[PDB]
Ligand binder design. Structure first.
Ligand code: IHP
Length: 87
């Protein structure tokens, strides 16, 4: 995607600051969400209810395969979006 990623970058850096995820991480993780059939479009990230299955799926593959690559990026984006949705 293009716009969706930029929207996240300007948002996460407002909460996490310098501890925010890199654009390269977001862009790569987004494709993972689609390939896994978790989300149809990157814009689906605006749905807070859909965060539950995604987070669960990520933690599952992380504890089973031993890879938290997408989990690390998701955790940051999730936290930023969660805080934003709380306001
Ligand atoms: O030119 P800008 O409007 O200031 O945006 C850039 C650009 O991001 P986009 O390609 O999504 O517009 C950089 O991407 P690249 O040119 O390196 O491919 C990205 O760098 P990273 O992908 O390595 O994160 C950088 O972010 P940063 O300044 O944290 O290095 C980010 O700048 P902004 O985050 O301030 O928009």
């Amino acid at each position: 995607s293009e716009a969706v990623i930029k929207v996240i970058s300007s948002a996460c850096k407002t909460y996490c600051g310098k501890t925010s995820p890199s654009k390269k991480e977001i862009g790569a993780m987004l494709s993972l969400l689609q390939k896994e059939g978790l989300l149809m479009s990157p814009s689906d990230l605006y749905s807070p209810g859909s965060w539950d299955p995604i987070t669960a799926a990520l933690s599952q593959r992380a504890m089973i395969l031993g890879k938290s690559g997408e989990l690390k990026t998701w955790g940051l984006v999730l936290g930023a979006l969660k805080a934003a949705r709380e306001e």
